Homo-oligomer: 303 residues x 6
Amino acid sequence: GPAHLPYGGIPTFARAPLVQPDGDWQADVAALGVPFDIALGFRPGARFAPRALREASLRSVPPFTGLDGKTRLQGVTFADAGDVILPSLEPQLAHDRITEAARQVRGRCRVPVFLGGDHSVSYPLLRAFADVPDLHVVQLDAHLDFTDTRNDTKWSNSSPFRRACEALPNLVHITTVGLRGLRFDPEAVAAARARGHTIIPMDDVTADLAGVLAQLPRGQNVYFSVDVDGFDPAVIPGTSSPEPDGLTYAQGMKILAAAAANNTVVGLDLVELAPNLDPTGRSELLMARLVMETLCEVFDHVL
Amino acid sequence: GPAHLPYGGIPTFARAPLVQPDGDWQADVAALGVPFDIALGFRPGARFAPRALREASLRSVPPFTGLDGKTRLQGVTFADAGDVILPSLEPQLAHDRITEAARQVRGRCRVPVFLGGDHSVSYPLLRAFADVPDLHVVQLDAHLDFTDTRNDTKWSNSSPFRRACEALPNLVHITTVGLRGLRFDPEAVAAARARGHTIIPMDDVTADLAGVLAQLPRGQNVYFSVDVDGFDPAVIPGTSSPEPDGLTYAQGMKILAAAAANNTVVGLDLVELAPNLDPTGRSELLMARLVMETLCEVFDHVL
Amino acid sequence: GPAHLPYGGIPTFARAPLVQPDGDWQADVAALGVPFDIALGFRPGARFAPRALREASLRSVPPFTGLDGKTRLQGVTFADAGDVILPSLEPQLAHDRITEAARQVRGRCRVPVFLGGDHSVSYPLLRAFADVPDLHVVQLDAHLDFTDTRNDTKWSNSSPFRRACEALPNLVHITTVGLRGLRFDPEAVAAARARGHTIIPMDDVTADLAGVLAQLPRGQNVYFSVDVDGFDPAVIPGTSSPEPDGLTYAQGMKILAAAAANNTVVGLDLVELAPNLDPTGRSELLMARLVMETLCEVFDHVL
Amino acid sequence: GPAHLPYGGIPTFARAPLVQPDGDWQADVAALGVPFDIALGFRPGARFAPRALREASLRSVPPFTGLDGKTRLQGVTFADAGDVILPSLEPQLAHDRITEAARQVRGRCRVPVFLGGDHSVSYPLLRAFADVPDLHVVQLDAHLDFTDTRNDTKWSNSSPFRRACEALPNLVHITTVGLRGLRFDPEAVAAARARGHTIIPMDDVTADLAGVLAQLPRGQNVYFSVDVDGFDPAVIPGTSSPEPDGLTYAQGMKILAAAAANNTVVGLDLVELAPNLDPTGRSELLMARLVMETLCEVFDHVL
Amino acid sequence: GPAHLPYGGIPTFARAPLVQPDGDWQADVAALGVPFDIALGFRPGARFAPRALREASLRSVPPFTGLDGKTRLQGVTFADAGDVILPSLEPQLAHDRITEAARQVRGRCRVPVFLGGDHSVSYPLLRAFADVPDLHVVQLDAHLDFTDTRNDTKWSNSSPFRRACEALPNLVHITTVGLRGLRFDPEAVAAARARGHTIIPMDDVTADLAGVLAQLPRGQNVYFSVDVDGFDPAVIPGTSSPEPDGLTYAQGMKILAAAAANNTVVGLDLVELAPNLDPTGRSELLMARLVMETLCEVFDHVL
Amino acid sequence: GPAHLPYGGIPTFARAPLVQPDGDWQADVAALGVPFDIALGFRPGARFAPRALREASLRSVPPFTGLDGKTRLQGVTFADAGDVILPSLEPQLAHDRITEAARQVRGRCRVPVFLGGDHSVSYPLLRAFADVPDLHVVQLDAHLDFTDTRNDTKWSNSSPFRRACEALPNLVHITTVGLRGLRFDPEAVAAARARGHTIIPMDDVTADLAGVLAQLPRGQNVYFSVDVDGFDPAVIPGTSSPEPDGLTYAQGMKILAAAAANNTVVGLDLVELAPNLDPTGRSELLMARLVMETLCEVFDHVL
Ligand SMILES: NCCCCCCN
Ligand SMILES: NCCCCCCN
Ligand SMILES: NCCCCCCN
Ligand SMILES: NCCCCCCN
Ligand SMILES: NCCCCCCN
Ligand SMILES: NCCCCCCN
Ligand SMILES: [Mn+2]
Ligand SMILES: [Mn+2]
Ligand SMILES: [Mn+2]
Ligand SMILES: [Mn+2]
Ligand SMILES: [Mn+2]
Ligand SMILES: [Mn+2]
Ligand SMILES: [Mn+2]
Ligand SMILES: [Mn+2]
Ligand SMILES: [Mn+2]
Ligand SMILES: [Mn+2]
Ligand SMILES: [Mn+2]
Ligand SMILES: [Mn+2]
């Protein structure tokens, strides 16, 4: 039968059927949105990212047959579990609802995809992976986000991984790639290193990408956390706090593809996208493709 | 339980459940989108209107308890039948698919709501009502849209009602309110008058609204066609061809309310909304409300 | 000597000298900003309003000599106390800081001007007026904002006056003008009415403005709360939740002028402006003028 | 044969043939642009107005057959003399080039149409009408623009008519309609009244439009000067310094229409349009139409 | 003699004299616009590209004297034949109108420059080159555009070269450079390879540009087709369907420069530019320069 | 205790205290804005750059502790001297106002930072350095700006350094890096070479950046002039006249860092930023950071 053009149809992620987090369904991949952006400290807009990503994903409906004739995501079913129902304010309640929804979705799919939302959502999201032994996180970001307190709060988008580690003893390591900028929280850097976390500055990527890939985990259970500001602002300008000289789409994708080829991917989140800050719409289009391309890599080599 | 905020959840019209035009369902109201805008002769964008209206409708989820404490649309069921699957180009095929979908939706609901799309969609939509005796159309528009041929085509957005009339002998009358502008197709005006159609210039609405309401049909089968450019550009700037000094939201709504109170409404379409032309977003927010408020009025007088 | 054009100089409200809330200063009028917008339920952006209003106020630097040759605000001194230092999240802490800064500013000026920020800021702002006998609030708004709980929180922008009344036994009456829309919280409306509050729908303003002015308070201590969405979206589109058919600038100004002529004005807040939602910039330009014109009226009838 | 749609073809005013100011041609109406905006004191952008107006005029190509079947501008020839070649800075030189071009275009048409550009262009433009006996100017504007010196200059957009009067003893009277705002130059107002100029505040138009029309000249040589900020900012937001509660399109047109039918119109300029400040594009669309409708009125009452 | 600044004068390509496609003129280079965008399957806007390109070209008026002091395009004459008069809808009629205009312009100049318009215009454009022996096409694009049918039509922007080949046996070869993305039409790829077409993925350009240049045709009659989406979205965001990691301006220009110095260039089109999708305006400014620089290279190697 | 988030507080550069140019203060670094943009020859907007840069600088408040734990600008004091009070038009008066303000600021700080404004401001700015022996200028720009006359004026943004040199024989040498484009003023290029100025095209940076750095001055009094269009438009699109293939932020910074490491930096200006042309806001965010990072380098190598 005829198929909808991108501007047609209800926008669900990858045009997947809609389901409830605690419903009776099962799928290889399931998306869950978290339209929460009140924890960021600059320009809001990320609450609109889940919807923008769903809309942009209509340009990337699986499966995909590449130029070389190979087809990826063949036989991979999808589901869109909608969005976590968030309260106004009440960060603690929002966190609990996010964790509960993430748990339910995780228990019904193989690889859950979480659409943020500012980076603070990664904390309650990760609480749903408490039973993953030696859980590792691979984070693309211009910022470390391992701060204890910022602007008198423990729940800002600058503390998700610090909060996650103190709540999850199974989260044994984090590899962050793309760090750059004039300012870094010394207490956060010290705390991350003290825990053996791997910090890879964007300088490393530029000088030797081959080496960066060489620093990625091997044979581990990995959770992907992609902060769109890890990418160069010229490529992805739609984000609150841009920092120059970031990852090209290709570099960020190469890092994700490599990690997904040598590890067991247990989930992925895409955060800090701000559609309202990029009127060209390329930010949401490229990031929706990023999620889909990452999934291609994952399922094209799973154990 | 908790409810989503406007920015949360999958955007279906009025958050109604998604169904297939020819699926096994029944509801009081059913929405059907027609993301077609290649027939307009100026600024494109109406193809994105159905999606924009669905998103905006999340701010107007029924039922409604007003300031006076009374509730409207209580117990009235809704369904979103998605969008007509349109081809690229191929206007004739597009028309056939639009009529087929509209027919299927019509047979399954009491009042169908069509989301355009440029005004040319009203022609194939009306074909789905060829069985309605003495069908009257109440049209809000700055333009008459009764032209025979324009820029070498019979299918432009300036010809929907002319096409509809020649194909539907049961379409016995059209009442158009809000006409204004420097240019009018003399052949179209003459043709409309000859068929006994009622033409109500905006100047008459400004001069005496009560008089205009008295010119509306009474005890007839009515199809509403709302071209957003009938409203003043200051109120609704998101449209291809704006004309100064149009209807305020209140005036247009009073006309729809009056007609809905004195006739049997068989359907309604909302066309020419161009979200891309109004970065403030008020155009879609207000027009989504207009559709919902019109339904409140329609169901307040169900015989 | 030469004076800056609007685009020159540091933007302080009315180009007034900068001071600290608890510093050693005194002035007739003092402005204080509250860049808080995490309590609204739709489109963010009001956190940028204080800055936008300051920039726009450079087009309205006092005193003003009108067409008739008469001068207003002559000799009236101004000061800009900057903004309340807000934390991230932590609504309760934010409230405490807002109340403290407001108290300090209030103690050093005759009429304090508060620039929001979403409407939730009116609650902590009003707490600074606990010592004002029989405090009356005159609120311009499309919404009532007298809700107890909304989306699982007590601190949303829909509850500021409910929170204020429970924290301030001296807040004996509220007059709200401009209400309109398909939905209202029935408990909020009934509670407000049962408390003796005056609700004036926009319909009444349109029907008989004189009658509305006659309903305003007289010989009372009055605090002005101006929610920009009380104004018609065509005039002021830059706001989160617009509702059609609102106050023209002239109508809103007549209401404020009337109240200022017959009462002791103790303060005023300007909330819900979202500069990011109006690329024409007219929203902040017109609202900055409203504040300045309101002050002209206040000081013209001060007792 | 076939005609271009608005988005097709080279944009010349009213789609008229292109000519040189000092070329060998003759026409009833001739357009001349003056992309000069370095004299305004706030938001630039008017330098692009001539081009925006030409593009917008493609929606208003003459002649016009209205709803009544009557045609206007039938047989009336048009020409586009392009723009004055302006230097960078060098206001004195720009003025001389403007006057020379205006003189040349004036000598080759019956009614010249000048597209600004900020209002300062009206001065060198008026210098080309030194031989018109008892010249009268009908100015639509929110401001008076009769200031002697502003920000240390004699050539700002606040001084065009003051400069014109001192250079043209034949300019015997000016009628300005639409004045509003909190500030007016007391010296400028006094100077205007001393010369017998007529000042009609927007309040007068609102209170009694009939009384306003009665103050317009009769049987005089009239030059129209339309500053788009005379119109309400909700209608025409694309302008540097908007002032609330202005003329609706209809009111401004009624004033121009009355004056056009009772006098010998020798010219007209349209200034202060800032396309860049109105992403909806309604400002240029409506103002291009304003010019064409004014012309319809002019040639509809030729002696 | 004084010359207009970019914002002055009537916008004709390269500020060249305006002429009719069938008029009495002759020039080395002639531009023809094709404001047709109803064939694309995503975001419209390309219909405004011809006009945007003309305006942007005022920043690149020939001749050009570089930093080395050498002058290019010296003595080369230009002309702007306006735009093809397109009907509404009626793709077949549009195609015929396009081919006829292309033929007329082709016979009055040496190198015709066609401004699109979506890519589907290349088909009717190429039909005007049926008499060119062993015609080779050098295509810059992220997409192949050799698809047979898409969304029930043979005339989408994904089929221009497929339609051109089955209609022009003299079209013996196509070299496409810049291909990338997750999805490629296997049937289209197979059909292209079966005809011996050269497919050069962006990866090859990145890996070895010298190798890519060595693959370009030599001593052949070449038609250049430049789809702006061949360039990286960071550089040229103004396009309907962007794909990450594309050609830099320099890389695309190097390809065109090399092909221009070793072949007989018979024409060039610039398609898919969507000015409405890039509010920074760099897309049209850079692409206008691309056409002009390509022309510099072309006439520096004419035999 | 707590500190403002970027959206909070009065926007002064680096959140530094506000002072008067001739006031009684002293600071290591002092900022002065020059909101002048009437000299550029294309798209206006730079007049708003000083304000945009100040706002953006709130994201770069000193001192800075990098990822390595080292802190820069520790103890370095800052001040914001506001903006030069500019007249409307009257370029010569503007120039004198600028030179005097710059001299006053220079005598109260070690390193003055000047915020433009179009590039023409560099001329009056440099006059404030008439007392510096063997003054060298390091200019990042896509254009040379050594033109004598352009569009009939001596004061355009294409002549700042030409004017500066003839007024300042002590300005012995200029090193311009980043030059590119199709057109260059041969007269300007010759005059610069004759004075021995070093011209470094962007191609040289791309080929061998190390070789470019080796060409920078050593042990000299250096004034930095950064024209944002020197950077690639993909990175910094907010500028009047962009040119493809420019400096990455990293490259521009490397050039500035190199010169600051072994020269006595006497001042720096940042010109041609046009915030209105980049709705993503990255242009001002990155350029504010550039200024701050340059200062970090400067004070890391003080003699
Ligand atoms: N790590 C401190 C700053 C992190 C900000 C988070 C995401 N933008
Ligand atoms: N009736 C001729 C013009 C109609 C245009 C249709 C809708 N914009
Ligand atoms: N009174 C309930 C809704 C109020 C919203 C507040 C302001 N927008
Ligand atoms: N009459 C003083 C102000 C005039 C400004 C001119 C036009 N905006
Ligand atoms: N080749 C199939 C897709 C082509 C789209 C055309 C231009 N964007
Ligand atoms: N050097 C001639 C052009 C310079 C323009 C200046 C800055 N944009
Ligand atoms: Mn992060
Ligand atoms: Mn980050
Ligand atoms: Mn219409
Ligand atoms: Mn219509
Ligand atoms: Mn409110
Ligand atoms: Mn409100
Ligand atoms: Mn004015
Ligand atoms: Mn004026
Ligand atoms: Mn393509
Ligand atoms: Mn293509
Ligand atoms: Mn430059
Ligand atoms: Mn420069």
